[PDB]
Amino acid sequence: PSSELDVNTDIYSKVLVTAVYLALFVVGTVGNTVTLFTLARKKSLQSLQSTVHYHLGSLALSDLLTLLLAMPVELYNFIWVHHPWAFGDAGCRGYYFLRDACTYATALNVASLSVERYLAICHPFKAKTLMSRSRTKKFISAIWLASALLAVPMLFTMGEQNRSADGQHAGGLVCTPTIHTATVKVVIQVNTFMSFIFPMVVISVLNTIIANKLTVMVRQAAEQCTVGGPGRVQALRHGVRVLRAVVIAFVVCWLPYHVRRLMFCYISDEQWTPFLYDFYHYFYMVTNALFYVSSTINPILYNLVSANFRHIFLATLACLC
Amino acid sequence: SIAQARKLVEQLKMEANIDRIKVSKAAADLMAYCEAHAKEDPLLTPVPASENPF
C-alpha cells in the first residue's frame, strides 16, 4: 500500500556500497584513532608545533566523529531500509544536528589548518610571538563551538513525518524536512554556501599562496651543493604535493554532496519524474561514498610525507598486532 | 690529602657534640605553631570576597 514510497534500486549495488562503506569505516576509524594516539605521544619541546598538532588532533577527532556518529545510522536506514525509519521521533533532528555539526567541524578544521600553515610559513617570525597554546586552544574550541551552533537550523528544519497515504501506518514514518520549502531552501543554501564556499575559498587562496612561496624556495635551493640539499628539495616538493592534494581532495570529496543537497532544494515537485527519483538515490549512494572518503584521507596524507609521524604510527600498529 | 681529611674530621667532631631535642617535643612545637597561626592564614582559611584583593 506504501509501495509508491519505496525506492527501488539494484540490490547488488546496495551490497557493493555497503562493502565500500565498511571498508571506509574500518580504515578511517583506525587511521584517526592511531593518529590521535601518535599526536598524544609527541611531548618534546612543545612551543609552536603544539599548535599545529592540536589542529591535526582536532581534524582527526572531527573525522572520527563523522564516521562514528554517521555511519551505522545512515548506512542502515538510508541504504537498506529507508522506509520505516526505525530510529524515531527526536532522533531524526538530533541525527541531522550531529551530522551537520560534524561536517562544519571538518570544514572549519581544514580551513583553520590552512590558516595556521599560512601563519607558520609565510609570516614565520610573527607566529611565535603572536600565537600561543592558549590562543590555539581558544581558536580550536571556538571553531568547534561555531560548528556546533551552525547546525541548529538543521535541528529545527528536520523532523519526522508520516508520508503514507493513510494517516497512521508502521512503514509510513520517514525522516524529512518539515518546514516550508522556501525556508528549508534558505537553510540548505546557507549550509551549502558556508560549509563549502567559505572553506573552498580560504583553502584555495591560502594553499595556493603557500605552494607558490615554497615553490619559490624550491627554485632558491635548486639555484644554490649542500649536505641536506637532496633532502630539502624532496621535502619541499612533497609539501607542494600535499597542498595540492588537500585542495583537490576537498573539491572531489565535498562538491557532489552539496550538489545533491542543492538539487534537492531547487527542484520543484512538478519537475520530479521517477527517472530523477531513481537517479537521485543512486546519486545519494555515490555522494556519501565521496563524502566518507574525506574522513579517511587525512591520516594517509600525514603518513605519506612526515617521516617522524610515519614510524611512531607503524610502531603503534605493530604494538597492537 | 691529609689536611682535607683533618678538616672533615674536625667538622664532624664539631657537629657531633651538639645537644639535641627529642622528636616528640619538636612535633609538639610544630603542631603548636600551626594551631597558633591557623586563624590568620588566607590559604588554609578561605577569605570572603570583600577582604580578598584578587
Partner: protein, 338 residues
C-alpha cells in the same frame, strides 16, 4: 695513617647517626594522627599575567605583597603589579642566561644571576628614573642558582661551584665564604630572624650555616638524588626540602634529623620549587610534570592539586601577607593563585 683518620670520620658519622636515633622517640605522624585534616584546598587562579617570551626560571615576591619580580631567558626581568597585572618595570639584562632573581626587603633593589656567574644588583628608585646597574658582584666561577638579600647591603648567594658566599654590596667583595659541599648547590633559604640560613646541594645534603660565625652548623641527609629547592618553615626551627627523586622531606633544626617525607606513587618527576604558607600547615611544591601539589605538612596528604600550566613549573612562592601564590613555569605564564 689517613686510613685511621678516615676511620675516625666514619666513627663520628656512626656516632652521630646513633645519637640522633637515640633522640628519635616517635615519628611526627603518630603525634599529628589525632589532628583533623585541612580539608580539600580548592584554589582558583586569578590575575594571569603575561609578557615573557621564553621560559620563566625564577620569581620572588615583594615584602609588601603588592609587587613581584620574575626573570626569563628573553633577556629581561619584569617587575609586576599583582593586584592589577601592570608592568611596573621591564629591565633588560646584560646577559640573557638567567636562573635566579631576588627582591629586596626594602623594595629598593633587585638581584639577578645565572650562567654568567655574576650576581648583578639593580637600583630601582633613582633620579632620572631608569633601572641602572648599581653594583655587579663577580668572582664566583660557577652558575648562580639562588641569590637572596639579607638587607639592602648584604646579599647571600648559592652557586654552581659548591660554595655559598655573603657579600657587602657597597664594597663589592665577598666577606664570608661558605664551603663544605661536594656537589654544587641549587638553593638557599634565609631564616625569619636572618641570623642563619640553609643551603641545599647536589650531594643530596642540606646544611645549616651561621652567617656571623661562617661555618656549617649541622648537616642533614636522608635521600638519594640531588635537591632543587628548600624553604624555611616560618617558625625557623624547621624547613622543607624539594628533592629530585619525587620526595619532599621536612627537616628539624633542633632535632637534627629527618622528620617526615611527602611522597606519592603517581609522581616520579623532580620537584623544582618549595614554599610554605604563613601558618606553615600547607606545603606547596611545583613539579616537572607541570602541576603543583598542596601538601599537608603534618600528615603527608595532598589536599589540593594546582593545574593549568602547560610546561614545567620552575618557580613559586607565597606572599608575606599570606594571601596569594604565584607560580611561574616554562610556558612563560605566571599565575597568581588564591
Amino acid at each position: 695513617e689517613l686510613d685511621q683518620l678516615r676511620q675516625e670520620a666514619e666513627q663520628l658519622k656512626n656516632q652521630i647517626r646513633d645519637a640522633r636515633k637515640a633522640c628519635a622517640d616517635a615519628t611526627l605522624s603518630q603525634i599529628t594522627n589525632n589532628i583533623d585534616p585541612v580539608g580539600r584546598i580548592q584554589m582558583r587562579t586569578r590575575r594571569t599575567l603575561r609578557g615573557h617570551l621564553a621560559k620563566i626560571y625564577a620569581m620572588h615576591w615583594g615584602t609588601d605583597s603588592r609587587l613581584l619580580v620574575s626573570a626569563s631567558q628573553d633577556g629581561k626581568l619584569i617587575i609586576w603589579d599583582s593586584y592589577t597585572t601592570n608592568k611596573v618595570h621591564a629591565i633588560p639584562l646584560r646577559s640573557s642566561w638567567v636562573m635566579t632573581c631576588a627582591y629586596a626587603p626594602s623594595g629598593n633593589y633587585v638581584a639577578c644571576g645565572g650562567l654568567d656567574n655574576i650576581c648583578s644588583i639593580y637600583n630601582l628608585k633613582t633620579r632620572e628614573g631608569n633601572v641602572r646597574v648599581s653594583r655587579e658582584l663577580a668572582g664566583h666561577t660557577g652558575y648562580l642558582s639562588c641569590c637572596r638579600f639579607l638587607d639592602d647591603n648584604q646579599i647571600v648567594t648559592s652557586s654552581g661551584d659548591t660554595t655559598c658566599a655573603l657579600w657587602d654590596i657597597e664594597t663589592g667583595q665577598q666577606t664570608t665564604t661558605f664551603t663544605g659541599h661536594t656537589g654544587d648547590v641549587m638553593s638557599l633559604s634565609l631564616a625569619p630572624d636572618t641570623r642563619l640560613f640553609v643551603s641545599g646541594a647536589c650531594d643530596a645534603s642540606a646544611k645549616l650555616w651561621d652567617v656571623r660565625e661562617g661555618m656549617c652548623r649541622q648537616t642533614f641527609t636522608g635521600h638519594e638524588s640531588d635537591i632543587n629547592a628548600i624553604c624555611f618553615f616560618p617558625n625557623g626551627n624547621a624547613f622543607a626540602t624539594g628533592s629530585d627523586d619525587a620526595t619532599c622531606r621536612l627537616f628539624d633544626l633542633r632535632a637534627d634529623q629527618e622528620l617526615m617525607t611527602y611522597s606519592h606513587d603517581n609522581i616520579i618527576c623532580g620537584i623544582t620549587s618549595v614554599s610554605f604558607s604563613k601558618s606553615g600547615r600547607l606545603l606547596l611544591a611545583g613539579y616537572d610534570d607541570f602541576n603543583c601539589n598542596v601538601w599537608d605538612a603534618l600528615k603527608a596528604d595532598r589536599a589540593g592539586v594546582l593545574a593549568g600550566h602547560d610546561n614545567r613549573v620552575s618557580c613559586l612562592g607565597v606572599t608575606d601577607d599570606g594571601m596569594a601564590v604565584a607560580t611561574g613555569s616554562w610556558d612563560s605564564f605566571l599565575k597568581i593563585w588564591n
